[PDB]
Ligand binder design. Sequence first.
Ligand SMILES: N=C(N)NCCC/C(NC(=O)c1ccccc1)=C(/N)O
Ligand SMILES: N=C(N)NCCC/C(NC(=O)c1ccccc1)=C(/N)O
Ligand SMILES: [Ca+2]
Ligand SMILES: [Ca+2]
Ligand SMILES: [Ca+2]
Ligand SMILES: [Ca+2]
Ligand SMILES: [Ca+2]
Ligand SMILES: [Ca+2]
Ligand SMILES: [Ca+2]
Ligand SMILES: [Ca+2]
Ligand SMILES: [Ca+2]
Ligand SMILES: [Ca+2]
Lengths: 628, 628
Amino acid sequence: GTLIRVTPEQPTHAVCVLGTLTQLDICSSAPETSFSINASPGVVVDITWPLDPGVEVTLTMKAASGSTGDQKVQISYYGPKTPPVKALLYLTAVEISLCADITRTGKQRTWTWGPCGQGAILLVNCDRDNLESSAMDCEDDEVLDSEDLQDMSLMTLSTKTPKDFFTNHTLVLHVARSEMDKVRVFQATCSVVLGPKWPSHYLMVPGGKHNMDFYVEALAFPDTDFPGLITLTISLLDTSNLELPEAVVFQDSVVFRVAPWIMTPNTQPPQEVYACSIFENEDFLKSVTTLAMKAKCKLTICPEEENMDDQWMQDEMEIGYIQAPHKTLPVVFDSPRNRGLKEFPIKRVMGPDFGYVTRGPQTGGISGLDSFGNLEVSPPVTVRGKEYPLGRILFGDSCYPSNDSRQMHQALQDFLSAQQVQAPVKLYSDWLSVGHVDEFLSFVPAPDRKGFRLLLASPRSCYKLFQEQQNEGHGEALLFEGIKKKKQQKIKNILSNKTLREHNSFVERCIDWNRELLKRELGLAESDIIDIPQLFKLKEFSKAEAFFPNMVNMLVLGKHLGIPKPFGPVINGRCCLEEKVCSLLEPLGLQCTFINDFFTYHIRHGEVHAGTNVRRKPFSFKWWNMVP
Amino acid sequence: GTLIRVTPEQPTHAVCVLGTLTQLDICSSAPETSFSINASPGVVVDITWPLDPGVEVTLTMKAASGSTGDQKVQISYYGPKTPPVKALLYLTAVEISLCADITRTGKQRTWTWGPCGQGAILLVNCDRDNLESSAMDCEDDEVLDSEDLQDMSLMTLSTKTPKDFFTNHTLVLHVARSEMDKVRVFQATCSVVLGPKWPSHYLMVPGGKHNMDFYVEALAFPDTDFPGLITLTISLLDTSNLELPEAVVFQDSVVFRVAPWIMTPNTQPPQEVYACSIFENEDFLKSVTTLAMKAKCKLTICPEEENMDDQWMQDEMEIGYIQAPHKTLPVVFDSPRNRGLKEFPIKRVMGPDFGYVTRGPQTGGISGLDSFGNLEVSPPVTVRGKEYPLGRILFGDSCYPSNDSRQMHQALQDFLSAQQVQAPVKLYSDWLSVGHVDEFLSFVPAPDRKGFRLLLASPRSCYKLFQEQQNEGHGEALLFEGIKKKKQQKIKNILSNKTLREHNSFVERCIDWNRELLKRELGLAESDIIDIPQLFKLKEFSKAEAFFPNMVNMLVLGKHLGIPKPFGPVINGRCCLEEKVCSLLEPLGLQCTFINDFFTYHIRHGEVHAGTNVRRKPFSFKWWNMVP
Ligand SMILES: N=C(N)NCCC/C(NC(=O)c1ccccc1)=C(/N)O
Ligand SMILES: N=C(N)NCCC/C(NC(=O)c1ccccc1)=C(/N)O
Ligand SMILES: [Ca+2]
Ligand SMILES: [Ca+2]
Ligand SMILES: [Ca+2]
Ligand SMILES: [Ca+2]
Ligand SMILES: [Ca+2]
Ligand SMILES: [Ca+2]
Ligand SMILES: [Ca+2]
Ligand SMILES: [Ca+2]
Ligand SMILES: [Ca+2]
Ligand SMILES: [Ca+2]
C-alpha cells in the first residue's frame, strides 16, 4: 500500500514495486473542481472526473522499467473558466521478489498448517557432514562442505530494475533481533550475511535482471521460548539524498517454520538395531544379531571400552527424525541420564546425515524417568475426530507430585510438547522401581483394525493361565525350570501366596489406570489391546519389579519379536508362558523368539527392549500437513 | 472411565464417583455361556444375555451412599446344565466435585475463549491491600486482610460420602510442579495448602456432606514462558491397605486462565490525571488542573522532592487494568527507564485496589523507546472481519535493525504480545530524536463513523496552511509571536527555506509509512484520519524534533483537549495554527485548550502528553469473550 501525493507546483518522482497497490492523492495539493488523467502505455489507471477526495485513483504497472521515470502520469486540473494546470508524476517500476518454497514441493507473510496451508520449512542443521569434526555443522558461521547445503533451505531474491537503479536505492536483508540467534543465512555466488549477531546486511545488487540465492539453516528446535517461526525480510531503501537518512520504500518477507523433532513408533519398519552387549554376556547378542538380519537391519554395537559397563542402550537415547520437502534425516535425542553410554550418541550416532539434540541438566538433577525407556510413541490414531497421524508421545509420570515422586525433567517435557505434532500424553509409571512406560506397554503391528495391538503386562492373565494349568493337574510344575541358580517355585505355591496376589492386585490397579488413560487419549477399544501374562513383586519402597522376565519389554522388528525368555512352568514339553504369548501374537502374523536375558539383564531390572534401540523409517505423512 | 473386574471366586469391592462412567468386565474371570444381572435399587444397569466380551455393561448410580457397599450387583453365570454361580460386587457411591466459576458470572478440563467458552478466570494479586506495606500481596504466603480475598478466585470442593469413608480413602489437592511457582491456594474455614514449593496437600475431610472453600491467587502474568493456564486437581486415593501404596481412584480438575494486563485508549473516559509539574513551572499545572476538573477527574501530582526534576510523567508508567467476573482493578506497568520518577509507581500508584507490574532490566540496557510515550493503544477496531474489541497496542520501532537503530526492549515486547488481547502492532518511530509514537499520533473521540479520529502530525498540512496565508497577503506574519526569547521567523522565509522543506519532506515520508501501516493493521480509511498541521526539523544524527510545539502530543480528556500552544503566526487577531486545529476538531465536538508549555516542556523535547498521564475506565467488553 502506497499513497503518492501529486502537485501542480512540482513534478513528483516515485518507485512502484510490481505486485503492490499504488494510489494517487489528487485532491490535497490541487489548485483552484474537475480533473482528468493521462498515463503512458505501461500504466493502468483504474478509477471527466470530479475533484472530491473520496474517489480512488489506483495505478498499476505491467512490467519493470528500462530507465528511471520511463512511465509518466499527467493529472490535468480544469474547471469553470480555467485553462488546464497539469501535474506530473514520473514512475519507475521494479520487480523485487523474495522467494522460498512456500508450497512445500521442493519448489502471504503468515505460516499456516495443513494440506492447503503456506509457508516454507527450515531444518535445524544439527548433523555433522564435516569430514573429521565433533561439532554440529550449525555451531560455526561457515558452509564447510557442499553437501551441507542439502540440509539448508533455498531462498532467492529476484530483481528486475533499470541498469542504474541501485545508484540511488539499496536493498537490505534482515531478521528481527529476537530471532537472529536461531537462524543463519548464507549468500551464494558461500558467506554469512545474517546470523546470531548480524541481524542485517546490505546486499550488493547490480541493476537490470539479477537473481541472488541464499541458503538458510536453523539453529534451535521449537521450545518453550520459541514457537518455531523465523521471519526474514528484504527492505528497499531510497538513498537518493545525501543529506537525509535512508527511507524505506517497500518490505517483503518469508516466514519459515522450523521442523520439529519426531519419534517413530514400533509399527514403523526398523532400519538399524543398537545393542551394547559387549560386556560379560555373548548369547544375548547372538539372538538380537539374528533378528536384525531377519528384519533386514544394519546392526551397530557398542563395545565395553566405550560402554563403561553400561548395557542399557534403550535409555541414553531416542532416534527420531526431522523432515522438510527438500531433506529428511534421522536425529538422536540424547537423554541427560549420562551414564556409561554418555558419549555414544555424540561420537557414534551423530554424523553424516544424522542429527543431534539434547536437553535437561548435564551434571545432576536427573531421575530414572529421564532415561528413554520412559520415552515412547503410539502408532497413528484418530481420537473422537482429532487425527494424530504421527501418533502421540507417551511418557511416564506419577499421578500427583509429592516428596517421594518422580518425573521426567520439565525441560525434556517442554521440548517434547513444543514439537507439537505428537501431542504428548503423560502416563503413570512411577509405581515401578525403574519407572519406565516400556515396563508395562509395547506396541506391535497387525494386519487388521487400525494396524497394531497395544500390549499391556497383565497379572490377571498369568493367574488365569496358572489356575487353568492347576485345574488340569499341573500344580507341581515349576516356574524357573532350566535355571541353575534360583529358588524354584511351584505353580501351586505361587497361587496360594496371598502377599504375591496382593502385590499383583496393586500392580494390576496401576496398569488398569494406564489402560483407561490410553483408551481415552488414543481412542482405543478393548479389541486394540492384548494382555501379556506377567507377574510382578513389590520390593524397596513398595515399588514394582518383574517376578520373571518382563515379556512386554520386547524388541519389535516388524513381524520379528525379541521377547525375554520367561523361564516358565514346563507343561507338555513347553513353557506355558511362551505358549500363551505365542497363542496371542502368532495369529497376528508375529514370530516370537524368546531370548535368554536372565543373568545379564533381568537380574539388573530390565530386559530385551531395555538393552536395545531401533532406528525406524520416518512416516511418509508430512508433519506440516497436520493441524495440531 | 473405570473397568471393574468381577469374579465368582471373590466378591469385589469398588467406589463409584457420581458423574463417572463405570463398566463391568464380566467375561475375563467367569467360570465354565450365559449371564444375568441383578442390582439393588440405586444402580442403573444399562446394557437373558450371552457371555461374549464385546457386550458393554455399564453401571450408573443415582445418589451418594449412606454406608460402604450399600449398593450391590449380582452377576449370575448359567448355561447348558449348570446351576447358577453368582459373583458379587459391592459398590459405594460418592460425590466429589471440584467447582469454580467456569461460566464467568461470579458463580470440561480445557479452557476455551469466547461467549460460548468455559473456564474460570484468575487474577494476578499484584496490588497492595495490606495496610502499611511495600510488597504486592502475592509476595508472601498469607492472607493478611479480609479484603484481599476479593481479588482471589473461589474454588469449592463438595463431598457427599458415608460417615466412615475417609478412614480408608484420602483426598489430595495438587498443581503440577511446572506451574506451582505461578499460583498460591489457601484453605478457608486462611492458610496455604498450595504454592511455590508445596505442589500437593492432603486435605482433612470428614465423611457425610462437606463443603470446603479455597481461595486462589496468581503470581505471574502470562509471558513468553507462561501461556497463562493453571490447572488444579483433586485426586481421590484408596488407602485401604496398610501394606501397599496409595492407589488413585478418581481425578478431577479446574483450569484457570490468568487475566492479561490491558491498556486503555484515549477514547475510554478519563478518571484520574497525573502530572509531576512541581518543578520550575506553575502555569502548566493550572491549565491541566482546569481540564481535569472540567473532565471530572481526580488529580494527582508528584512534587519535586519525589520527581528528582523528572517532569515526564507519561514515560515511566502506563496505567492499564486486569479484569475477572468477580473483580476488576487498575494496574500500573512500570517502565524500566528508571529516571527521577522511578519510585512514583511503586510508592504512590501501587496500593489498595491498584496493581503493579514491571519488566525489562532495572539497571541499564535501556533505550528511549522503553519509555511509555512510545506505548499506546488504538480504539476498538475490526480489520477485514477480525474484531479487536479492546483495540491494539501500538509501539514504536525502527524499520529494520542496524548498529544505530533502537527498539523497545524485547522483554517488554514479549510481555505485551503474551497478553494476547490487544495484539501489538509495531510502528516506525525511530526517525524521531526521542522516538515515541505519541510524537506523531493521537486518537480522539468522535460521535460518528467508528467513534474516533486518528490524528497524525502533518508537515503537508502546515505548508498548505502557510502558503494559503501568504497567498492572502500575510507573508510577513511571524511564527513565534508572543515569545520573549527566540529567533522570530516570517512565513515567507519559512516557505522559501529549501532545507526545512527537504527535512519535512523526509518526515512526511516517515509519517506516511505509519499512516499506511495503521490503515492496514487497524482497518482505517482516509475518513478516519485528521491531519494536524505540524513542522519538524532534523538535528543530531538526522533525527526529527518538533519545529514548534508538537500539537499532536496532546492530553485527551474526553471532549476536553490539552494541546500545546504553537506560538503560530497571528492573523486576524489569532494564531492560524490554533485556528486550523480548531476548525478540524471543533466540528467533532472537541474543546481545544492551548497550553503554554514552551520553556518548560517543548525546549526539552516533549509537550503536554509527554508531561502527563491518564488512568481511564476499563472496557465494558470482557476480554475472555474475545477469540484472539
Ligand atoms: N526398562 C528400561 N528401558 N531400562 C531399565 C534399566 C534398568 C537399570 N538397572 C540398573 O542400572 C541396575 C540394576 C542392579 C544393579 C546396578 C544397576 C536402570 N535402573 O537404569
Ligand atoms: N514524547 C514523550 N512521551 N516524552 C518525551 C520526553 C523527552 C525527554 N527529554 C529530555 O529528557 C531532555 C531534553 C533536553 C535536556 C535534558 C533532558 C526524554 N528524552 O525523555
Ligand atoms: Ca557451518
Ligand atoms: Ca549439515
Ligand atoms: Ca546423554
Ligand atoms: Ca546432511
Ligand atoms: Ca524409548
Ligand atoms: Ca498475601
Ligand atoms: Ca490483593
Ligand atoms: Ca520504572
Ligand atoms: Ca484489592
Ligand atoms: Ca503511553
